[PDB]
Design a protein around this ligand. Structure first.
Ligand SMILES: *[C@@H]1O[C@H](CO)[C@@H](O)[C@H](O)[C@H]1NC(C)=O
Lengths: 49, 160, 242, 46, 23, 48, 48
């Protein structure tokens, strides 16, 4: 997923754009993954329980 | 020593004696008249919203058009009255002629849209009041900068 | 060629010159201050040298001062409405610089035409070149250019001493087609090198990253560029030489 | 018999608007987009 | 003359290879 | 088909084993050219 | 009171009559050319 960001290939972001522009872009992406990861963990942790 | 931004946004502050001003006071009118006449025209073409106000609109423009027309017609003759330069004088007249022609040909055509604008049947007339206005807007200003130029070009004639 | 170039067209019609086989750097550019405003969207300048290239396209035309801002994504305005529409994605660079020592004829540069009327505010990159009277309003306007209807296109008449708000600019716009296919216009490198079985960062034109590279036991389609993992990561690539 | 060997596309098709068509020879594809003025009904040779 | 186009028409979405994976 | 000012064409070649039918089989379709031509398409005809 | 009424004053002595909340129903006015002008300013004939 791309979470609004222009590509899930964060390297493209690390490659195409400039870091000042990247921060805003990379910020959107990391949010969603970080959002997803914890969702998986809670999913795990209850399932573990 | 004049605070004037000629057509197409060019600002010119003369450095001469009075007779340039007494040749460019009409320019200090016409250029004053020019944008002010046009400053509504840029407004009307996109603010037009009401059926009857088109009659007021197309009457206002043609009315406001000719306030430029006479001034731009006479912006040059007062400029070419002190004509040490035939080029500036002729260019004063040519620019005065053509632009005022543009300011006194289209002005009656502006009345032509004021014809149906009286009723202002909101079907398509407000659409067509929009149409020529920009066509008017673009055409007038360009003729008027070169108008606003040749007049000071004529004011530059007896500028020293 | 097209920059130190001779003669440029209108805005409603232009010259998409597809370019191939090139090794473009664009660092010959973005250092020549002779570029007035240089704002880029998909890529940032000084970075468009690395791997992002498959048959880009160019765009040359001319316009006066203020009009440059209108050319960005969105940016609604007459030239962007009936004359030149820019899509909302992957837009690359936009070169603007002054066209005044080649333009602005004495009595006016009368030869730059913008579509004054057109239904259907332009679709992306649409070229409506035909000049038929607008047929505006419930009316016959049939070769007559008469009431409520007149020539769809108008000039500007820039003067050699014209105003800066309308001093005319020569504007270049570059589209960028990304990663779909064999690349064509790369940035200087080559590394002349290729090694297997070793952790090495890689730039096989289609991605960056680090891994271990083996001659793969899987068959591809000839036209076909390269695979991808279910993880949406690069399963494998075809070395453009090997 | 390669009896069908080309296409047509466009909006007005007779130079009133930009048009598109393609022709397939025996061995080498031939295409163009132009200001076409079509025949009202296509055919080809032998 | 009208026939039933049963299932023909599926065409490659793009030029990115994938392997034995549903998508 | 045309999207965003392009044009795309696809091909395939399986044998023919029918007279008055259309095969009830399936094979994939593969890209030919991503034709980048700025035209509107609404009418189209073939060439025999 | 202004159309079906009987008597009117002069023109310079135009009698003011403000009408507050009720339904106007200009349709009986619209579907009637009993007038000379029916001329409208700022708002068109029947759209009001
Ligand atoms: C291919 O088509 C072109 C255009 O009609 C023609 O000039 C050429 O002779 C053809 N070649 C073959 C081998 O059919």
């Amino acid at each position: 997923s791309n979470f609004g960001a222009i590509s899930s290939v964060l390297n493209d972001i690390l490659s195409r754009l400039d870091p000042p522009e990247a921060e805003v872009q990379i910020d959107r992406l990391i949010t969603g993954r970080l959002q997803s990861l914890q969702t998986y963990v809670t999913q795990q942790l209850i399932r573990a329980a | 020593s004049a605070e004037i931004d000629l057509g197409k946004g060019d600002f010119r502050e003369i450095r001469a004696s009075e007779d340039a001003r007494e040749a460019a006071e009409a320019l200090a009118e016409a250029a004053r008249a020019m944008k002010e006449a046009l400053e509504i025209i840029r407004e009307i073409a996109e603010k037009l919203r009401d059926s009857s106000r088109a009659s007021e609109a197309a009457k206002r423009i043609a009315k406001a058009i000719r306030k430029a027309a006479d001034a731009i017609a006479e912006a040059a003759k007062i400029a070419a009255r002190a004509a040490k330069d035939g080029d500036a004088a002729r260019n004063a007249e040519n620019a005065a002629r053509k632009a005022k022609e543009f300011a006194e040909e289209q002005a009656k055509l502006a009345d032509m849209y004021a014809e149906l604008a009286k009723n202002g049947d909101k079907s398509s007339v407000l659409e067509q009041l929009k149409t020529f206005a920009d066509k008017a807007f673009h055409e007038m200003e360009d003729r008027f900068y070169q108008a606003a130029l040749a007049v000071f070009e004529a004011a530059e004639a007896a500028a020293g | 060629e097209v920059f130190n170039a001779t003669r440029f067209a209108s805005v409603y019609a232009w010259n998409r010159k597809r370019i191939s086989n090139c090794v473009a750097d664009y660092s010959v550019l973005y250092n020549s201050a002779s570029f007035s405003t240089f704002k880029c969207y998909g890529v940032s300048p000084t970075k468009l040298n690395d791997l992002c290239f498959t048959n880009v396209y160019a765009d040359s035309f001319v316009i006066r001062g203020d009009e440059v801002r209108q050319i960005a994504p969105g940016q609604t305005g007459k030239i962007a409405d009936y004359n030149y529409k820019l899509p909302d994605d992957f837009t690359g660079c936009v070169i603007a610089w002054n066209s005044n020592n080649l333009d602005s004829k004495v009595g006016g540069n009368y030869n730059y035409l913008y579509r004054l009327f057109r239904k259907s505010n332009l679709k992306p990159f649409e070229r409506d070149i035909s000049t038929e009277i607008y047929q505006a309003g419930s009316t016959p306007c049939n070769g007559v250019e008469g009431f409520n209807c007149y020539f769809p296109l108008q000039s500007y008449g820039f003067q050699p001493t014209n105003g800066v708000g309308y001093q005319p600019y020569r504007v270049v716009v570059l589209s960028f087609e990304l990663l779909h296919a064999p690349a064509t216009v790369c940035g200087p490198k080559k590394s002349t090198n290729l090694v297997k079985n070793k952790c090495v960062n890689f730039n096989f034109n289609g991605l960056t990253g680090t891994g271990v590279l083996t001659e793969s036991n899987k068959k591809f389609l000839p036209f076909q560029q390269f695979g991808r993992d279910i993880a949406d990561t690069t399963d494998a690539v075809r070395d453009p030489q090997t | 018999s390669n009896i069908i060997r080309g296409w047509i596309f466009g909006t007005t098709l007779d130079s009133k608007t930009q048009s598109l068509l393609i022709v397939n020879n025996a061995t080498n594809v031939v295409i163009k987009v132009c200001e076409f003025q079509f025949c009202n009904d296509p055919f080809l040779g032998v | 003359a009208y026939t039933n186009s049963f299932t023909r028409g599926v065409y490659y979405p793009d030029k990115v290879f994938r392997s034995s994976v549903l998508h | 088909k045309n999207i965003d000012g392009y044009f795309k064409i696809y091909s395939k070649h399986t044998p023919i084993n029918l007279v008055r039918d259309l095969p009830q089989g399936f094979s994939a379709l593969e890209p030919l050219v991503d034709l980048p031509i700025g035209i509107n398409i609404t009418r189209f005809q073939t060439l025999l």
